Amino acid sequence: ALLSFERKYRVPGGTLVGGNLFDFWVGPFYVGFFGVATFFFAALGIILIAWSAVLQGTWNPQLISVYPPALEYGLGGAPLAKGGLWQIITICATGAFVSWALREVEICRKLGIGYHIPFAFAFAILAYLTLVLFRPVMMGAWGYAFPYGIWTHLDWVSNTGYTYGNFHYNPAHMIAISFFFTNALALALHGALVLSAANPEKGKEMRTPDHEDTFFRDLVGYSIGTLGIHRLGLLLSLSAVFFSALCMIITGTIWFDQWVDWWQWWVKLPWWANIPGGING
Amino acid sequence: DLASLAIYSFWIFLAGLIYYLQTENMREGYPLENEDGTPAANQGPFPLPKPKTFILPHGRGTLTVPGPESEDRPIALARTAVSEGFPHAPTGDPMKDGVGPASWVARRDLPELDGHGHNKIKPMKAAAGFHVSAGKNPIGLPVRGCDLEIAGKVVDIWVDIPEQMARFLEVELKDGSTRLLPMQMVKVQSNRVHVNALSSDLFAGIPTIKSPTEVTLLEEDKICGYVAGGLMYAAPKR
Amino acid sequence: EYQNIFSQVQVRGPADLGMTEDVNLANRSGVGPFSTLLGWFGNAQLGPIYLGSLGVLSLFSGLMWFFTIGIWFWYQAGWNPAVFLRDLFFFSLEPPAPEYGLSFAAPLKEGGLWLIASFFMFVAVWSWWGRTYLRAQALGMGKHTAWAFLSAIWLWMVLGFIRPILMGSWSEAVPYGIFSHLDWTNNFSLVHGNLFYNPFHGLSIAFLYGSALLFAMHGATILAVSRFGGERELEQIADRGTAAERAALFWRWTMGFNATMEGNHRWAIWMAVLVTLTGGIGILLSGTVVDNWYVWGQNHG
Ligand code: BCL
Ligand code: BCL
Ligand code: BCL
Ligand SMILES: CC[C@H]1c2cc3[nH]c4c(c3C)C(=O)[C@H](C(=O)OC)c4c3nc(cc4[nH]c(cc(n2)[C@@H]1C)c(C(C)=O)c4C)[C@@H](C)[C@@H]3CCC(=O)OC/C=C(\C)CCC[C@@H](C)CCC[C@@H](C)CCCC(C)C
Ligand SMILES: [Fe+3]
């Protein structure tokens, strides 16, 4: 039940709500007030998904799907079986997410470390609430949100995108993808650097941050440094998710035509709109 | 066909990999213990890995993990309930006793060394050619704690030589003695440094270093430990 | 309460010329400038870089790749600066039509230039790969970087060389242009039945997303424990301190299991490497073995 060095930290304190009432663990798990909140919302949510499954008639998880109220309902409620379940499941999801974040804050306070983790998580929560709450509200219908099923939500990704031609031309989407890819590069390098120092050539002694800096300067003329790379992964990560949210918040609301056509502004600038030759004259 | 052969092999390779990765992250804290320090009954489904040995750079030795485990130190805590799963109350003063968010580990009582074998961290005064290069220089600013009372003055910055960064502020007390505050737990404002983890009376309580041009890993832990703990434990005085 | 995203004080000393190990020092340049800007975030020191032969081969064919694509773009612009800038994203250097199969006999102005550019790229990438191994060897370090980079090379190899070969033609490879390569990509998906049905594609995404997940976790964790020297990961690996302890414990209390300071880097190297590993099989199998991912997916084989 405990890691060899763990007891000294399992002290009272740090709770945000409830004082010492739920200040306890279950095996490895800390139970906030917010542990209880997440269990409550996740349990409900799961039950209503199992329910929604029988009303649709499968117990197979590759097929189970929960659609939002069809466009016809706008922002109102809708009967359980025609997307009310989705509405309650969504509210449950949000409850479970924010709860999990808030539980994290309490774990942070007990450990006396910074709030960076829940703060990062908060960007993912915010991406979710863009697909399910902010976009559908700026659009006028829960129907625009995505449904809850392994394969069916991909269907939504493809339908939503192709509504704008090749979604590649969404410029905020370009930027986000750029962050996702860079993030992965950074991750591969960070892991390979640290590990290449802790596990050097063989019988050789552990290398040092000095070596890690050296290797990167030797390689590209620059090394960001051990604090830097951690600041970086964070920033690349979160920026990817920011631009994801941003690229979808603007689609269907401030831009709704073919993303390819947005680029006409640059090509049709006065100073060059008319010169002949090239691809656009 | 070839593709269903590939995808199915991959799922297997990926199970192998999770296995390797999961055991690999057991080289520390394992085996699991009950609240009383005893080997727990149920260990999980992953075995410990065969040990590995890192060779440490400066005739500094070896580490072989997994190996026999222990805090090499007392733990001023006691049980507050009658079964597994609840908190353990500090038996004395948790800051002074280094438990809870004031905890520190029995890290090695020498200093981290650079790649050249020299101390990685030095007070700026002993660091040849090193000066403050951007941002407000804190040296000379009064240090104010969360009670809004002045607890001393900044007298040097301790720097990481190979990585060229601030790591501590050395702060002087009414006493005339000094203490290290971790660079990451201070606000350098224009006319003061602000330290929210501690109130003025807890500065004396900061663990002290045995020599004024070195810190040992152990001392660093007791220092960082102490000041982080203040966020929970100073908060009455705050 | 301060957050360690930007430094409050920068500190500079003598420029760090770095560890001499078995490195041939004849080949390191001298230090570059120090950037105060960069130094709010990470290291302020630029340089020194090491260049020697393989380095130069690489830097040279890199440039040659780039200038090949570059003259064609200016050509496509009919030598007019205004047009060039306007239509920058629309220019495109396409490979040979399917009629030339794999032969190098295509006219310069209709795909020969593509093969030339591709040739320069091939040697730039591989020589750089070698540089990746050799800069490690000289420092006595393990070979992880080179192995990880090899994963990236795999996808890139498959896209532009291995897959066009098994397919019988270069027309199958990816053009050089900002927009045209996005088109190639959407079009590739379409022709193969929608890559959402390609289970290697789906894995690929899980890893891509998973990388953003991990690095956000990892970065955040380290910053959170950086008030106990958490970022000095190597020395936390050789002698666990409270930073490594409280980071393990946060995860363990949150999700019920956790990593070690060294183990987390293995999670990282693999999460990222798996994106392209995965992805490369995904593409490699397309058109060579599966002609339609929807279809293949219906019989699961
Ligand atoms: C044919 C389809 C279109 C297309 C249409 C779209 C559409 C439409 C969308 C994207 C979005 C994205 N696309 Mg695009 N996209 C295309 C081509 C690409 C290509 C490519 C190589 O060609 C790439 C790399 C990308 C990349 C991207 C990203 C920028 C983004 C997805 C990540 C994200 O938003 O995370 C955000 C992360 C989350 C929302 C996860 C949230 C997690 C929550 C908080 C917690 C869940 C916990 C869980 C329930 C608990 C599990 C229990 C455990 C088991 C215990 N697109 C093609 C052209 N793309 C999406 C986007 O930008 O979203 C804003 C989006 O909506
Ligand atoms: C982000 C932009 C798009 C999107 C586009 C895609 C695309 C495109 C793909 C996926 C894929 C996945 N997406 Mg999706 N997906 C979206 C939002 C979500 C949300 C959410 C709560 O917002 C969730 C939970 C998921 C979950 C999933 C998984 C079933 C799968 C692997 C993801 C992954 O590894 O991430 C990284 C995270 C980890 C590695 C952590 C582990 C996460 C685990 C696996 C989540 C389990 C979800 C569970 C099956 C459903 C919850 C039910 C519970 C009982 C409550 N997607 C939005 C709508 N998603 C891939 C797939 O393969 O689908 C078949 C794929 O190609
Ligand atoms: C509408 C378009 C299609 C689609 C078609 C494709 C195609 C086609 C491909 C992908 C690929 C991918 N797609 Mg898809 N994709 C779609 C929708 C999505 C969505 C979504 C809808 O939300 C997402 C999240 C993704 C995500 C992804 C990635 C997981 C994967 C690319 C991994 C990568 O790192 O590449 C980037 C990394 C590289 C290209 C490696 C390059 C490394 C080389 C060696 C370095 C070159 C640098 C060079 C020298 C220049 C350097 C200059 C510097 C400045 C010095 N796709 C839809 C269904 N997708 C790729 C894949 O693997 O699929 C299985 C791919 O080929
Ligand atoms: C840049 C931010 C990146 C990020 C960061 C991030 N994620 C995080 C964190 C952070 C910092 C955590 O601290 C937290 C964690 O604990 O990690 C282990 C987490 C987390 N991110 C997770 C998933 C997740 N993150 C993703 C993405 C991202 N995470 C971003 C890329 C994705 C993607 C890419 O799709 C997924 C799938 C979980 C592992 C964990 C959050 C666990 C949690 O919140 O638990 C509470 C809830 C439950 C246990 C049960 C579900 C509740 C019910 C209401 C039912 C189902 C809801 C429904 C929407 C299902 C949808 C169906 C699908 C088929 C589509
Ligand atoms: Fe790290």
Side-chain angles (χ1 to χ4, degrees), chain B residues 12-40:
Chain B
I12 287 146
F13 165 84
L14 178 61
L17 175 78
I18 284 168
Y19 184 77
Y20 163 81
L21 285 158
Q22 187 50 35
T23 63
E24 230 31 59
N25 290 265
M26 302 179 52
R27 298 183 115 111
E28 297 259 1
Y30 291 79
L32 299 190
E33 292 180 10
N34 313 104
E35 307 196 328
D36 79 333
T38 270

PDB file of all heavy atoms in Angstrom, chain B residues 12-40:
ATOM      1  N   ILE B  12       1.140  -7.089 -29.420  1.00  0.00           N
ATOM      2  CA  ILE B  12       2.021  -7.916 -28.571  1.00  0.00           C
ATOM      3  C   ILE B  12       3.316  -7.157 -28.177  1.00  0.00           C
ATOM      4  O   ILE B  12       3.654  -7.046 -27.004  1.00  0.00           O
ATOM      5  CB  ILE B  12       2.362  -9.314 -29.246  1.00  0.00           C
ATOM      6  CG1 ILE B  12       1.147 -10.252 -29.225  1.00  0.00           C
ATOM      7  CG2 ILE B  12       3.615  -9.997 -28.582  1.00  0.00           C
ATOM      8  CD1 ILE B  12       1.096 -11.130 -30.453  1.00  0.00           C
ATOM      9  N   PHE B  13       4.033  -6.633 -29.158  1.00  0.00           N
ATOM     10  CA  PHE B  13       5.188  -5.836 -28.862  1.00  0.00           C
ATOM     11  C   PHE B  13       4.795  -4.781 -27.843  1.00  0.00           C
ATOM     12  O   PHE B  13       5.490  -4.591 -26.858  1.00  0.00           O
ATOM     13  CB  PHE B  13       5.727  -5.196 -30.132  1.00  0.00           C
ATOM     14  CG  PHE B  13       6.690  -4.098 -29.881  1.00  0.00           C
ATOM     15  CD1 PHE B  13       8.037  -4.376 -29.656  1.00  0.00           C
ATOM     16  CD2 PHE B  13       6.256  -2.759 -29.859  1.00  0.00           C
ATOM     17  CE1 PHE B  13       8.954  -3.324 -29.426  1.00  0.00           C
ATOM     18  CE2 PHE B  13       7.150  -1.692 -29.603  1.00  0.00           C
ATOM     19  CZ  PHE B  13       8.490  -1.965 -29.391  1.00  0.00           C
ATOM     20  N   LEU B  14       3.686  -4.081 -28.058  1.00  0.00           N
ATOM     21  CA  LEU B  14       3.286  -3.033 -27.110  1.00  0.00           C
ATOM     22  C   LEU B  14       2.993  -3.527 -25.688  1.00  0.00           C
ATOM     23  O   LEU B  14       3.295  -2.821 -24.729  1.00  0.00           O
ATOM     24  CB  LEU B  14       2.139  -2.208 -27.670  1.00  0.00           C
ATOM     25  CG  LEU B  14       1.507  -1.085 -26.841  1.00  0.00           C
ATOM     26  CD1 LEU B  14       2.520   0.006 -26.490  1.00  0.00           C
ATOM     27  CD2 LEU B  14       0.275  -0.474 -27.557  1.00  0.00           C
ATOM     28  N   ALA B  15       2.427  -4.721 -25.528  1.00  0.00           N
ATOM     29  CA  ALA B  15       2.322  -5.305 -24.193  1.00  0.00           C
ATOM     30  C   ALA B  15       3.713  -5.541 -23.538  1.00  0.00           C
ATOM     31  O   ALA B  15       3.945  -5.082 -22.401  1.00  0.00           O
ATOM     32  CB  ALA B  15       1.506  -6.557 -24.204  1.00  0.00           C
ATOM     33  N   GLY B  16       4.626  -6.234 -24.248  1.00  0.00           N
ATOM     34  CA  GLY B  16       6.019  -6.349 -23.856  1.00  0.00           C
ATOM     35  C   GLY B  16       6.592  -5.002 -23.440  1.00  0.00           C
ATOM     36  O   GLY B  16       7.125  -4.854 -22.356  1.00  0.00           O
ATOM     37  N   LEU B  17       6.442  -3.993 -24.274  1.00  0.00           N
ATOM     38  CA  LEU B  17       6.969  -2.686 -23.941  1.00  0.00           C
ATOM     39  C   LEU B  17       6.363  -2.123 -22.628  1.00  0.00           C
ATOM     40  O   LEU B  17       7.126  -1.721 -21.708  1.00  0.00           O
ATOM     41  CB  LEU B  17       6.798  -1.720 -25.113  1.00  0.00           C
ATOM     42  CG  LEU B  17       7.219  -0.284 -24.825  1.00  0.00           C
ATOM     43  CD1 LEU B  17       8.735  -0.140 -24.875  1.00  0.00           C
ATOM     44  CD2 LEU B  17       6.630   0.651 -25.825  1.00  0.00           C
ATOM     45  N   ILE B  18       5.024  -2.110 -22.503  1.00  0.00           N
ATOM     46  CA  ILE B  18       4.426  -1.626 -21.245  1.00  0.00           C
ATOM     47  C   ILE B  18       5.037  -2.390 -20.078  1.00  0.00           C
ATOM     48  O   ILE B  18       5.362  -1.828 -19.058  1.00  0.00           O
ATOM     49  CB  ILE B  18       2.863  -1.626 -21.283  1.00  0.00           C
ATOM     50  CG1 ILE B  18       2.424  -0.422 -22.119  1.00  0.00           C
ATOM     51  CG2 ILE B  18       2.204  -1.576 -19.873  1.00  0.00           C
ATOM     52  CD1 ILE B  18       0.973  -0.398 -22.525  1.00  0.00           C
ATOM     53  N   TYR B  19       5.264  -3.672 -20.272  1.00  0.00           N
ATOM     54  CA  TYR B  19       5.818  -4.483 -19.227  1.00  0.00           C
ATOM     55  C   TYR B  19       7.234  -3.969 -18.840  1.00  0.00           C
ATOM     56  O   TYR B  19       7.485  -3.534 -17.684  1.00  0.00           O
ATOM     57  CB  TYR B  19       5.830  -5.933 -19.687  1.00  0.00           C
ATOM     58  CG  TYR B  19       6.299  -6.898 -18.627  1.00  0.00           C
ATOM     59  CD1 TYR B  19       5.459  -7.289 -17.580  1.00  0.00           C
ATOM     60  CD2 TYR B  19       7.631  -7.419 -18.669  1.00  0.00           C
ATOM     61  CE1 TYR B  19       5.932  -8.190 -16.601  1.00  0.00           C
ATOM     62  CE2 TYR B  19       8.117  -8.310 -17.694  1.00  0.00           C
ATOM     63  CZ  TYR B  19       7.265  -8.686 -16.667  1.00  0.00           C
ATOM     64  OH  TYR B  19       7.756  -9.553 -15.710  1.00  0.00           O
ATOM     65  N   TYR B  20       8.157  -4.007 -19.795  1.00  0.00           N
ATOM     66  CA  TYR B  20       9.440  -3.380 -19.592  1.00  0.00           C
ATOM     67  C   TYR B  20       9.310  -1.988 -18.908  1.00  0.00           C
ATOM     68  O   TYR B  20       9.862  -1.778 -17.832  1.00  0.00           O
ATOM     69  CB  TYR B  20      10.204  -3.329 -20.917  1.00  0.00           C
ATOM     70  CG  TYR B  20      11.369  -2.356 -20.929  1.00  0.00           C
ATOM     71  CD1 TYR B  20      12.616  -2.699 -20.362  1.00  0.00           C
ATOM     72  CD2 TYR B  20      11.235  -1.088 -21.512  1.00  0.00           C
ATOM     73  CE1 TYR B  20      13.708  -1.779 -20.364  1.00  0.00           C
ATOM     74  CE2 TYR B  20      12.302  -0.177 -21.523  1.00  0.00           C
ATOM     75  CZ  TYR B  20      13.542  -0.524 -20.965  1.00  0.00           C
ATOM     76  OH  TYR B  20      14.588   0.403 -20.997  1.00  0.00           O
ATOM     77  N   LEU B  21       8.548  -1.065 -19.493  1.00  0.00           N
ATOM     78  CA  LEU B  21       8.439   0.273 -18.919  1.00  0.00           C
ATOM     79  C   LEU B  21       7.943   0.222 -17.476  1.00  0.00           C
ATOM     80  O   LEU B  21       8.550   0.828 -16.581  1.00  0.00           O
ATOM     81  CB  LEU B  21       7.547   1.155 -19.758  1.00  0.00           C
ATOM     82  CG  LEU B  21       8.202   1.638 -21.055  1.00  0.00           C
ATOM     83  CD1 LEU B  21       7.216   2.051 -22.091  1.00  0.00           C
ATOM     84  CD2 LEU B  21       9.157   2.790 -20.772  1.00  0.00           C
ATOM     85  N   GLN B  22       6.890  -0.556 -17.218  1.00  0.00           N
ATOM     86  CA  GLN B  22       6.357  -0.589 -15.882  1.00  0.00           C
ATOM     87  C   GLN B  22       7.343  -1.148 -14.881  1.00  0.00           C
ATOM     88  O   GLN B  22       7.454  -0.622 -13.787  1.00  0.00           O
ATOM     89  CB  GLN B  22       4.997  -1.272 -15.786  1.00  0.00           C
ATOM     90  CG  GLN B  22       4.343  -1.149 -14.378  1.00  0.00           C
ATOM     91  CD  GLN B  22       4.275   0.314 -13.759  1.00  0.00           C
ATOM     92  OE1 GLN B  22       4.089   1.354 -14.459  1.00  0.00           O
ATOM     93  NE2 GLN B  22       4.414   0.368 -12.421  1.00  0.00           N
ATOM     94  N   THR B  23       8.083  -2.193 -15.230  1.00  0.00           N
ATOM     95  CA  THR B  23       8.989  -2.757 -14.215  1.00  0.00           C
ATOM     96  C   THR B  23      10.134  -1.762 -14.031  1.00  0.00           C
ATOM     97  O   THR B  23      10.547  -1.462 -12.886  1.00  0.00           O
ATOM     98  CB  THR B  23       9.582  -4.084 -14.602  1.00  0.00           C
ATOM     99  OG1 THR B  23      10.392  -3.886 -15.771  1.00  0.00           O
ATOM    100  CG2 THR B  23       8.497  -5.106 -14.839  1.00  0.00           C
ATOM    101  N   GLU B  24      10.619  -1.232 -15.152  1.00  0.00           N
ATOM    102  CA  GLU B  24      11.659  -0.241 -15.129  1.00  0.00           C
ATOM    103  C   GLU B  24      11.347   0.891 -14.121  1.00  0.00           C
ATOM    104  O   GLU B  24      12.235   1.375 -13.425  1.00  0.00           O
ATOM    105  CB  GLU B  24      11.771   0.294 -16.533  1.00  0.00           C
ATOM    106  CG  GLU B  24      13.127   0.356 -17.169  1.00  0.00           C
ATOM    107  CD  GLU B  24      14.097  -0.683 -16.752  1.00  0.00           C
ATOM    108  OE1 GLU B  24      13.888  -1.905 -16.899  1.00  0.00           O
ATOM    109  OE2 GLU B  24      15.149  -0.249 -16.269  1.00  0.00           O
ATOM    110  N   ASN B  25      10.092   1.309 -14.005  1.00  0.00           N
ATOM    111  CA  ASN B  25       9.778   2.366 -13.025  1.00  0.00           C
ATOM    112  C   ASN B  25       9.553   1.869 -11.602  1.00  0.00           C
ATOM    113  O   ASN B  25       8.975   2.610 -10.776  1.00  0.00           O
ATOM    114  CB  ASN B  25       8.567   3.228 -13.458  1.00  0.00           C
ATOM    115  CG  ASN B  25       8.862   4.124 -14.668  1.00  0.00           C
ATOM    116  OD1 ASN B  25       9.216   5.274 -14.518  1.00  0.00           O
ATOM    117  ND2 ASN B  25       8.725   3.586 -15.850  1.00  0.00           N
ATOM    118  N   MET B  26       9.989   0.632 -11.316  1.00  0.00           N
ATOM    119  CA  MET B  26       9.966   0.081  -9.930  1.00  0.00           C
ATOM    120  C   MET B  26      11.348   0.049  -9.227  1.00  0.00           C
ATOM    121  O   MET B  26      11.534  -0.532  -8.138  1.00  0.00           O
ATOM    122  CB  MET B  26       9.303  -1.269  -9.925  1.00  0.00           C
ATOM    123  CG  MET B  26       7.917  -1.167 -10.477  1.00  0.00           C
ATOM    124  SD  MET B  26       6.940  -2.672 -10.594  1.00  0.00           S
ATOM    125  CE  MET B  26       7.073  -3.302  -8.941  1.00  0.00           C
ATOM    126  N   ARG B  27      12.315   0.728  -9.824  1.00  0.00           N
ATOM    127  CA  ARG B  27      13.653   0.669  -9.315  1.00  0.00           C
ATOM    128  C   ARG B  27      13.811   1.525  -8.036  1.00  0.00           C
ATOM    129  O   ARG B  27      14.929   1.821  -7.626  1.00  0.00           O
ATOM    130  CB  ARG B  27      14.624   1.032 -10.427  1.00  0.00           C
ATOM    131  CG  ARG B  27      14.507   0.031 -11.524  1.00  0.00           C
ATOM    132  CD  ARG B  27      15.462   0.239 -12.641  1.00  0.00           C
ATOM    133  NE  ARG B  27      16.359  -0.888 -12.660  1.00  0.00           N
ATOM    134  CZ  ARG B  27      16.388  -1.823 -13.608  1.00  0.00           C
ATOM    135  NH1 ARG B  27      15.601  -1.770 -14.657  1.00  0.00           N
ATOM    136  NH2 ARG B  27      17.224  -2.828 -13.511  1.00  0.00           N
ATOM    137  N   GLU B  28      12.701   1.870  -7.385  1.00  0.00           N
ATOM    138  CA  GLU B  28      12.687   2.885  -6.355  1.00  0.00           C
ATOM    139  C   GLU B  28      11.324   2.865  -5.716  1.00  0.00           C
ATOM    140  O   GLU B  28      10.298   2.733  -6.404  1.00  0.00           O
ATOM    141  CB  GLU B  28      12.946   4.301  -6.916  1.00  0.00           C
ATOM    142  CG  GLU B  28      14.321   4.557  -7.584  1.00  0.00           C
ATOM    143  CD  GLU B  28      15.403   5.319  -6.750  1.00  0.00           C
ATOM    144  OE1 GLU B  28      15.209   5.713  -5.564  1.00  0.00           O
ATOM    145  OE2 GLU B  28      16.484   5.538  -7.337  1.00  0.00           O
ATOM    146  N   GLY B  29      11.308   3.014  -4.390  1.00  0.00           N
ATOM    147  CA  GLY B  29      10.083   2.871  -3.584  1.00  0.00           C
ATOM    148  C   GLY B  29       9.533   1.462  -3.435  1.00  0.00           C
ATOM    149  O   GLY B  29       8.586   1.270  -2.681  1.00  0.00           O
ATOM    150  N   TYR B  30      10.112   0.489  -4.148  1.00  0.00           N
ATOM    151  CA  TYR B  30       9.636  -0.881  -4.043  1.00  0.00           C
ATOM    152  C   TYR B  30      10.643  -1.768  -3.283  1.00  0.00           C
ATOM    153  O   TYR B  30      11.858  -1.482  -3.267  1.00  0.00           O
ATOM    154  CB  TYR B  30       9.246  -1.503  -5.414  1.00  0.00           C
ATOM    155  CG  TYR B  30       8.016  -0.904  -6.058  1.00  0.00           C
ATOM    156  CD1 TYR B  30       8.103   0.320  -6.723  1.00  0.00           C
ATOM    157  CD2 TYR B  30       6.761  -1.545  -6.021  1.00  0.00           C
ATOM    158  CE1 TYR B  30       6.970   0.927  -7.339  1.00  0.00           C
ATOM    159  CE2 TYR B  30       5.599  -0.943  -6.655  1.00  0.00           C
ATOM    160  CZ  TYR B  30       5.740   0.307  -7.305  1.00  0.00           C
ATOM    161  OH  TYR B  30       4.721   0.983  -7.910  1.00  0.00           O
ATOM    162  N   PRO B  31      10.145  -2.867  -2.667  1.00  0.00           N
ATOM    163  CA  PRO B  31       8.728  -3.202  -2.586  1.00  0.00           C
ATOM    164  C   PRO B  31       7.915  -2.266  -1.708  1.00  0.00           C
ATOM    165  O   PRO B  31       8.427  -1.656  -0.769  1.00  0.00           O
ATOM    166  CB  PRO B  31       8.723  -4.599  -1.955  1.00  0.00           C
ATOM    167  CG  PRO B  31      10.091  -4.798  -1.408  1.00  0.00           C
ATOM    168  CD  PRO B  31      10.982  -4.028  -2.320  1.00  0.00           C
ATOM    169  N   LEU B  32       6.642  -2.186  -2.055  1.00  0.00           N
ATOM    170  CA  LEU B  32       5.617  -1.626  -1.234  1.00  0.00           C
ATOM    171  C   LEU B  32       5.663  -2.106   0.219  1.00  0.00           C
ATOM    172  O   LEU B  32       6.066  -3.247   0.519  1.00  0.00           O
ATOM    173  CB  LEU B  32       4.273  -1.963  -1.856  1.00  0.00           C
ATOM    174  CG  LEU B  32       4.081  -1.407  -3.259  1.00  0.00           C
ATOM    175  CD1 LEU B  32       2.604  -1.586  -3.708  1.00  0.00           C
ATOM    176  CD2 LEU B  32       4.525   0.061  -3.288  1.00  0.00           C
ATOM    177  N   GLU B  33       5.232  -1.209   1.105  1.00  0.00           N
ATOM    178  CA  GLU B  33       5.320  -1.413   2.541  1.00  0.00           C
ATOM    179  C   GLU B  33       3.958  -1.121   3.153  1.00  0.00           C
ATOM    180  O   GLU B  33       3.189  -0.345   2.558  1.00  0.00           O
ATOM    181  CB  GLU B  33       6.367  -0.469   3.176  1.00  0.00           C
ATOM    182  CG  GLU B  33       7.827  -0.742   2.795  1.00  0.00           C
ATOM    183  CD  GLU B  33       8.796   0.235   3.468  1.00  0.00           C
ATOM    184  OE1 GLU B  33       8.378   1.018   4.379  1.00  0.00           O
ATOM    185  OE2 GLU B  33       9.996   0.212   3.094  1.00  0.00           O
ATOM    186  N   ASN B  34       3.651  -1.722   4.314  1.00  0.00           N
ATOM    187  CA  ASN B  34       2.512  -1.234   5.094  1.00  0.00           C
ATOM    188  C   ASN B  34       2.916   0.012   5.838  1.00  0.00           C
ATOM    189  O   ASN B  34       4.084   0.372   5.872  1.00  0.00           O
ATOM    190  CB  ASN B  34       1.919  -2.268   6.087  1.00  0.00           C
ATOM    191  CG  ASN B  34       1.708  -3.657   5.461  1.00  0.00           C
ATOM    192  OD1 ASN B  34       2.500  -4.575   5.727  1.00  0.00           O
ATOM    193  ND2 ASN B  34       0.676  -3.804   4.603  1.00  0.00           N
ATOM    194  N   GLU B  35       1.933   0.664   6.439  1.00  0.00           N
ATOM    195  CA  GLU B  35       2.159   1.913   7.170  1.00  0.00           C
ATOM    196  C   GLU B  35       3.267   1.757   8.235  1.00  0.00           C
ATOM    197  O   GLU B  35       3.869   2.733   8.650  1.00  0.00           O
ATOM    198  CB  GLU B  35       0.827   2.435   7.749  1.00  0.00           C
ATOM    199  CG  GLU B  35      -0.291   2.566   6.674  1.00  0.00           C
ATOM    200  CD  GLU B  35      -1.469   3.428   7.111  1.00  0.00           C
ATOM    201  OE1 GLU B  35      -1.789   3.443   8.307  1.00  0.00           O
ATOM    202  OE2 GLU B  35      -2.098   4.102   6.279  1.00  0.00           O
ATOM    203  N   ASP B  36       3.571   0.522   8.627  1.00  0.00           N
ATOM    204  CA  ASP B  36       4.499   0.298   9.702  1.00  0.00           C
ATOM    205  C   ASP B  36       5.919  -0.056   9.237  1.00  0.00           C
ATOM    206  O   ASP B  36       6.775  -0.358  10.060  1.00  0.00           O
ATOM    207  CB  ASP B  36       3.945  -0.770  10.618  1.00  0.00           C
ATOM    208  CG  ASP B  36       4.145  -2.212  10.074  1.00  0.00           C
ATOM    209  OD1 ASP B  36       4.239  -2.477   8.826  1.00  0.00           O
ATOM    210  OD2 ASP B  36       4.188  -3.102  10.962  1.00  0.00           O
ATOM    211  N   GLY B  37       6.152  -0.060   7.923  1.00  0.00           N
ATOM    212  CA  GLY B  37       7.496  -0.267   7.370  1.00  0.00           C
ATOM    213  C   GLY B  37       7.783  -1.660   6.892  1.00  0.00           C
ATOM    214  O   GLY B  37       8.853  -1.964   6.389  1.00  0.00           O
ATOM    215  N   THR B  38       6.786  -2.496   7.064  1.00  0.00           N
ATOM    216  CA  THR B  38       6.796  -3.928   6.772  1.00  0.00           C
ATOM    217  C   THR B  38       6.443  -4.177   5.308  1.00  0.00           C
ATOM    218  O   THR B  38       5.568  -3.463   4.770  1.00  0.00           O
ATOM    219  CB  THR B  38       5.750  -4.526   7.730  1.00  0.00           C
ATOM    220  OG1 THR B  38       6.456  -4.849   8.890  1.00  0.00           O
ATOM    221  CG2 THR B  38       5.073  -5.759   7.256  1.00  0.00           C
ATOM    222  N   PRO B  39       7.086  -5.189   4.664  1.00  0.00           N
ATOM    223  CA  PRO B  39       6.707  -5.592   3.268  1.00  0.00           C
ATOM    224  C   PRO B  39       5.203  -5.874   3.160  1.00  0.00           C
ATOM    225  O   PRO B  39       4.684  -6.655   3.937  1.00  0.00           O
ATOM    226  CB  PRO B  39       7.511  -6.870   3.004  1.00  0.00           C
ATOM    227  CG  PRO B  39       8.525  -6.960   4.093  1.00  0.00           C
ATOM    228  CD  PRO B  39       8.088  -6.085   5.260  1.00  0.00           C
ATOM    229  N   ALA B  40       4.510  -5.197   2.247  1.00  0.00           N
ATOM    230  CA  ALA B  40       3.069  -5.368   2.103  1.00  0.00           C
ATOM    231  C   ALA B  40       2.790  -6.741   1.504  1.00  0.00           C
ATOM    232  O   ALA B  40       3.668  -7.345   0.871  1.00  0.00           O
ATOM    233  CB  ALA B  40       2.464  -4.267   1.269  1.00  0.00           C
TER     234      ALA B  40
END
